[PDB]
């Protein structure tokens, strides 16, 4: 059984879609297509869902760009590790930091931590310059230019 | 709540789509006895399309003057002239979800 | 050719919310649509997927009667509907656009405890 | 000069804004986050611009063969009409995934008469992308160049891009 988790809400208006809220478990029963037919764990209810809105739930913060649990003395030593490049970059923790490996000729190689912040509405911002509505954007927003950070974030920082 | 449920992924209309949305809007709070306007149309149009995936190029209907039927069967909303361009308003009928009037006044439109 | 897709995210302003009003002023626009918690939830969709403002800054005054809005620059109110036809001598609520609001916090007049 | 192309049309309401149309060539002069300041290299207006709705000029997205956000079925109507011929194709992306990428091919038989097939484009571990495994290119414009050389598998040579 392939077990999904809602990311947004959904409400269906077509009789034959389901409605769920954000957290919702369910069933995934039918995946052709991007409209999943699935079935809801908690109600029973069946029907199509907008693939988009959900995750596997074995994938859970299974991002390569995530580190779960690791402490800033570690992210450090990590990401200074050779093997790594400029601009190689860890997200670690609901509170988020972003570490960002750099270069200076005079200082040699650093790495740069910026907090993640997040507002009432729950967008997440390093800057008030630019807000984002999940993580992924951010990196990826991030990845396309540096934007004020030290370096333009380049690859996830190497496993040891 | 947050994040803003995102586009979900296209799919067709359908005359079963089209029958559950007009069914969907005619409730007290939708789009019944509004006046239509081409802004107002376009925003409807965004909505479901973000919200429900269907593409925005279903809800047309036959030329004027008078009341003007909706081009896809299922849909059931018209637009009705206000009698005193013509001031349209949507008007619901539940009639349309078996009877094409579009395609009864326009055949040319479906061949 | 495709649907113009969600723009990035971006603050709610005074300035924005004050273009927004006057862009939605014009006839076919917001102006004297009665008001209803679905289409009010539609045009917060719209302006969040078109201009990239998190739609929980349309907020207004409790009733009854006139709701101001919270957000200093929407020029909208919400007020008790009136016929077109003015009768002769002898809660329903539509949008309403007042040029005012611009200048005037009324609700902040009205209401002080929802500001800090 | 950083000059940028609409993939989109863009109606602004804010007076900061700068509204635009599919194909308007801009300036940007100020890239700081999402909203970019930018100029119309038509109009000279100046103005902020969403910065997902524009591309590099001579990029990926600003490619004759590349067709942002076109859908399967609008794909075999443009494929179809007049004007394209045997091999006539076009890239496409979805909205709704990022990297996702599909082949759309004018191709004839005598059972079908005139059709369309439709060919996903994997990416690796790597980033490279391919149709099958035999043939991985770095790039999609490799890959386009390749498939233009030999069908290779493919119900026909590419030829030239739809419309």
Request: proline share 6%; net charge neutral; glycine share 8%.
């Given at each position: 059984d392939i077990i999904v988790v809602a990311l947004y809400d959904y409400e269906a208006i077509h009789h034959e879609d389901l409605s769920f809220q954000k957290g919702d478990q369910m069933v995934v029963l039918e995946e052709s297509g991007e409209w999943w037919k699935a079935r809801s764990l908690a109600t029973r209810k069946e029907g199509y869902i907008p693939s988009n809105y959900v995750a596997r739930v074995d994938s859970?913060?299974?991002?390569?760009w995530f580190f779960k649990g690791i402490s800033r003395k570690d992210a450090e030593r990590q990401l200074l590790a050779p093997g790594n490049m400029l601009g190689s970059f860890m997200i670690r923790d609901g509170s988020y930091s972003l570490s960002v490996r750099d270069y200076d000729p005079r200082q040699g190689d650093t790495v740069k931590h910026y907090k993640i912040r997040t507002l009432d509405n729950g967008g997440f911002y390093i800057s008030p310059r630019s807000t984002f509505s999940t993580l992924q954007e951010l990196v990826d927003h991030y990845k396309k230019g540096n934007d004020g950070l030290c370096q333009k974030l380049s690859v996830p920082c190497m496993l040891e | 709540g947050f994040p803003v449920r995102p586009q979900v992924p296209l799919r067709p209309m359908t005359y079963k789509a089209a029958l559950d949305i007009s069914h969907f809007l005619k409730e007290?709070?939708?789009?019944?006895?509004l006046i239509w306007s081409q802004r107002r149309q376009e925003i409807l149009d965004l909505w479901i399309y973000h919200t429900?995936?269907?593409?925005?190029?279903?809800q047309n209907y036959t030329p004027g003057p008078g009341i003007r039927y909706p081009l896809?069967?299922?849909?059931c909303f018209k637009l009705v002239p206000v009698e005193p361009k013509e001031v349209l308003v949507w008007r619901f009928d539940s009639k349309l979800a078996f009877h094409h009037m579009a395609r009864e006044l326009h055949p040319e439109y479906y061949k």
């Amino acid at each position: 059984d392939i077990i999904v988790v809602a990311l947004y809400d959904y409400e269906a208006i077509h009789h034959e879609d389901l409605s769920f809220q954000k957290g919702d478990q369910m069933v995934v029963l039918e995946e052709s297509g991007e409209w999943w037919k699935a079935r809801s764990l908690a109600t029973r209810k069946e029907g199509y869902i907008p693939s988009n809105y959900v995750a596997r739930v074995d994938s859970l913060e299974t991002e390569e760009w995530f580190f779960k649990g690791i402490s800033r003395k570690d992210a450090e030593r990590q990401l200074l590790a050779p093997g790594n490049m400029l601009g190689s970059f860890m997200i670690r923790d609901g509170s988020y930091s972003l570490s960002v490996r750099d270069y200076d000729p005079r200082q040699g190689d650093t790495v740069k931590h910026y907090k993640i912040r997040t507002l009432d509405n729950g967008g997440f911002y390093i800057s008030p310059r630019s807000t984002f509505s999940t993580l992924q954007e951010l990196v990826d927003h991030y990845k396309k230019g540096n934007d004020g950070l030290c370096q333009k974030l380049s690859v996830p920082c190497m496993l040891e | 709540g947050f994040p803003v449920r995102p586009q979900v992924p296209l799919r067709p209309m359908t005359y079963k789509a089209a029958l559950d949305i007009s069914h969907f809007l005619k409730e007290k709070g939708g789009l019944e006895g509004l006046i239509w306007s081409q802004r107002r149309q376009e925003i409807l149009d965004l909505w479901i399309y973000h919200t429900q995936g269907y593409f925005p190029d279903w809800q047309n209907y036959t030329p004027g003057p008078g009341i003007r039927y909706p081009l896809t069967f299922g849909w059931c909303f018209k637009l009705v002239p206000v009698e005193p361009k013509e001031v349209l308003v949507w008007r619901f009928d539940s009639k349309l979800a078996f009877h094409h009037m579009a395609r009864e006044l326009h055949p040319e439109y479906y061949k």
